[PDB]
Design a protein around this nucleic acid. Structure first.
Ligand SMILES: Nc1ncnc2c1ncn2[C@H]1C[C@H](O)[C@@H](COP(=O)(O)NP(=O)(O)OP(=O)(O)O)O1
Ligand SMILES: [Mg+2]
Length: 577
DNA sequence: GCGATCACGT
DNA sequence: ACGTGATCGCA
């Protein structure tokens, strides 16, 4: 029983309400709002969008911070309303973020999955209403209106039990002071978008398509035959059958053609180096040139990513359409793709600030390892210092290969450390990789104590927590399968580190957003990628940002070691180095 | 649509 | 390890 309203009435504008602003298109940027539902003390309402959104009283209510709304995934609605020039304020409860904080492993992606966490099943999953894939379609108004009102009624009913459990978990402030404020900041970042120099991308695409046409022909000559180089199946026939190259590794369904395997194969035939060259070129051309060009809005030449705030098990943000968190940086030929990301206005510049080794600094603090804390208090090169201890040599005796192996141990130490992964990344034996680990724990006994203690805490409590009380349940920590249990143990060690770094970055974003407004700067956040914050700002604001941004980031939280921030700026994302 | 494979950045 | 994405090849 609900009201299919033809007009906005005063009772729909109570100062507390569950609100549903339904955007069915997966990418909500400039997307239709197919319907609105309001549940409050006075009843349940369905409002047609081309009525409420043209009603001054409803729009005023949407934008009044004092009128509190409970929603699911408020950022989706916030952004769709931004594209209509409408401001959404007063969202005091986001059931999506609440369910994500209560248990990220649930993969709660719609109201029904979250309600099922609390034995509430009077709401259908979105996929049952809209179908999936080709069959996906908005249903007739009666069916649509019933779904939206059931979702709003579930949100209405679910706020208290979710807030109660968040409070029992000591996560009430995590939701209200971190994730929900961050949702608004992310909505502004997505809406602003990042300007793309498409002519430069097009220029790069033409060039890659040229080098590809060359390497391709060369491969057809070394193979004495034509074939689809991009088919791992076909390529395996040319390599491990026609050319008789050794089979060093075998995927689950045949021969592996990983760059890992091919590297070891290069000595046997000149084709291998070209196939490797062809694959990097092909990866750039198809994923980063053509892929980026597909998602650039032709009206504004901006990409408007979507930050997924309730996806990872660590609390890190994820990004889609495009995923800007893997634009090439390692290789120079692929690093130049960042030259296409420019300021959205003339005489503006890109400013980029990144935490320096925040994960290892977080580890130092959490493990209270004297050796690790002292290394950062002296602002040492951590990889070089790690090599000095592991190999018991002075700084002058550290060779480039020793530092490379110390760096791999550090990369592993923060991601669990397994032996097979270290041995794999270092192309060494497990016993040798095991020897590296034990030398490391000899040098960093507090890290070893932390790794043992956090595993035991994961087993006793059933979860691990981050600095700001994000938790991750680890049910497989007791499993009797060595592999399933090993992964759970490594997530026990890694999650407090990665998740705490994620907490710090999110808090810095909130602190930076407040400071920029305090200082009345025009600078604005565009992207959070990994441990970096990217802003654009007028060139006249660069000197102030050079002091402001690192200070806010370095003060986001107080650890037992300093937080270091490297920052650069330039006319492009590339040049902000 | 869907599994398998590959690869990119943390 | 976190993921996003693209290509291919079979239903
Ligand atoms: N554990 C982690 N988890 C997620 N992202 C990480 C990370 N560690 C680094 N990133 C990012 C953060 C860093 O800003 C970025 C680059 O640092 P690196 O090359 O990975 N290792 P470093 O800088 O300490 O030693 P060198 O002097 O040889 O460069 O990788
Ligand atoms: Mg670093």
């Amino acid at each position: 029983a609900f009201t299919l309203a033809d007009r906005v009435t005063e009772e729909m504008l109570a100062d507390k309400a569950a609100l549903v602003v339904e955007v069915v298109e997966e990418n909500y940027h400039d997307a239709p709002i197919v319907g609105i539902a309001v549940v409050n003390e006075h009843g349940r309402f369905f409002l047609r969008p081309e009525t409420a959104l043209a009603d001054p009283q409803f729009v005023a209510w949407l934008g009044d911070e004092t009128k509190k709304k409970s929603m699911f995934d408020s950022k989706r609605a916030a952004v769709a309303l931004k594209w209509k020039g409408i401001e959404l304020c007063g969202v005091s409860f986001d059931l999506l973020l609440a369910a994500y904080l209560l248990d990220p492993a649930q993969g709660v992606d719609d109201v029904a999955a979250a309600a099922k966490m609390k034995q509430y099943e009077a709401v259908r999953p979105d996929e049952a209403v809209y179908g999936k894939g080709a069959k996906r379609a908005v249903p007739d108004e009666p069916v649509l209106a019933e779904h939206l009102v059931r979702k709003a009624a579930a949100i209405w009913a679910l706020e208290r039990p979710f807030l109660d459990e968040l409070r029992r978990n000591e996560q009430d402030r995590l939701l209200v002071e971190l994730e929900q404020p961050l949702s608004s900041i992310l909505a502004e970042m997505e809406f602003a978008g990042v300007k793309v120099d498409t002519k430069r991308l097009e220029q790069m695409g033409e060039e890659l398509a040229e080098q590809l046409r060359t390497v391709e022909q060369r491969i057809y000559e070394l193979a004495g035959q034509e074939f689809n180089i991009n088919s791992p199946k076909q390529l395996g026939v040319i390599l491990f059958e026609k050319l008789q190259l050794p089979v060093l590794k075998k995927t689950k369904t045949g021969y592996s053609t990983s760059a890992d395997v091919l590297e070891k194969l290069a000595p046997y035939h000149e084709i291998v180096e070209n196939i490797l060259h062809y694959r990097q070129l092909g990866k750039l051309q198809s994923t980063y040139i053509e892929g980026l060009l597909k998602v650039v809005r032709p009206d504004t030449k901006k990409v408007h990513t979507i930050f997924n705030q309730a996806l990872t098990q660590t609390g890190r943000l994820s990004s889609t359409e495009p995923n800007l968190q893997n634009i090439p940086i390692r290789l120079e030929e692929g690093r130049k793709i960042r030259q296409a990301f420019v300021p959205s206005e003339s005489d503006w510049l890109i400013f980029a600030a990144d935490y320096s080794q925040i994960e290892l600094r977080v580890l130092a603090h959490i493990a209270e390892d004297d050796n690790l804390m002292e290394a950062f208090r002296r602002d040492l090169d951590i990889h070089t210092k790690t090599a000095m201890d592991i190999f018991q040599v002075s700084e002058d005796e550290v060779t480039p290969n020793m530092r490379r192996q110390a760096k791999a141990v550090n990369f592993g130490i923060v991601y669990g450390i397994s032996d097979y992964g270290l041995a794999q990344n270092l192309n060494i034996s497990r016993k040798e990789a095991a020897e590296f680990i034990e030398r490391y724990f000899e040098s960093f006994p507090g890290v070893k104590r932390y790794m043992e203690n956090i595993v035991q805490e994961a087993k006793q409590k059933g979860y691990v927590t981050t600095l700001l009380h994000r938790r991750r349940y680890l049910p497989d920590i007791t499993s009797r399968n060595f592999n399933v249990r090993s992964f759970a143990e490594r997530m026990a060690m890694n999650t407090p580190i990665q998740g705490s770094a994620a907490d710090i970055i999110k808090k810095a974003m909130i602190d930076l957003n407040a400071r920029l407004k305090e200082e009345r700067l025009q600078a604005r956040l565009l992207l959070q990628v990994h441990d970096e914050l990217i802003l654009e700002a007028p060139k006249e604001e660069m000197e102030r940002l050079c002091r402001l941004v690192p200070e806010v980031m370095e003060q986001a939280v107080t650890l037992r070691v300093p937080l270091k921030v490297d920052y650069h700026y330039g006319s492009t994302w590339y040049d902000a180095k």
